Structure 1
Amino acid sequence: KAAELIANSLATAGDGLIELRKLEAAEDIAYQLSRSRNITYLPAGQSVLLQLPQ
């Protein structure tokens, strides 16, 4: 039914409608397949306690 609706709205919306829906969908497909990423640290502590001699 969703297909029917999309097609119907597509038709009312004309060709331009079709094109960018296709591009959004393609973009979605690309999103789903492509996703990946990572972040990392080099965990090192260290702090400085500076004391003046008196």
Structure 2
Amino acid sequence: RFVVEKAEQQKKAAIISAEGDSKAAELIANSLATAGDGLIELRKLEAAEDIAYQLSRSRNITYLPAG
């Protein structure tokens, strides 16, 4: 029964996060429908740089050639 109460609180805290994500998506969609998805390409390049840096110290990560 107390676990059910916990699940009720978790449902509340998940609806809240869903509202946050929905607001973010609303803003970004309103922007991108009019503008176009170039920001996504720029973020792709920035994330490629950032990930290549993040994995630059692990010794168990290997980069095999494409295909």
- Normalised TM-score (structure 1): 0.39
State the secondary structure of the residue aligned to 1:34: coil
Matched, 1:7 2:29: yes
Structure ranking higher in strand proportion: 2
Unpaired stretches in structure 1, ≥5 consecutive residues:
46-54
How far does residue 6 in structure 1 lie from its aligned partner after superposition? 6.2
Query: How many residue pairs were aligned?
Result: 45
How far does residue 13 in structure 1 lie from its aligned partner after superposition? 5.1
In 2 relative to 1, CA 28–13 (structure 1 residues): closer, same or farther, beyond 3 Å?
Answer: farther
In 2 relative to 1, CA 39–8 (structure 1 residues): closer, same or farther, beyond 3 Å?
Answer: closer
- Identify which of 24, 28, 34 aligns with 2:46: 24
Larger radius of gyration, structure 1 or 2? 1
- Normalised TM-score (structure 2): 0.33
After TM superposition, the runs of 4+ consecutive aligned structure 1 residues lying more than 3 A away are: 1-13, 35-45
How far does residue 19 in structure 1 lie from its aligned partner after superposition? 0.1
How far does residue 14 in structure 1 lie from its aligned partner after superposition? 2.2
Identity %: 100
Moved more, 34-43 or 20-29: 34-43
Q: Which has the higher contact order (CA 8 A, sep 6+)?
A: 1
The alignment's C-alpha RMSD in Å is: 11.2
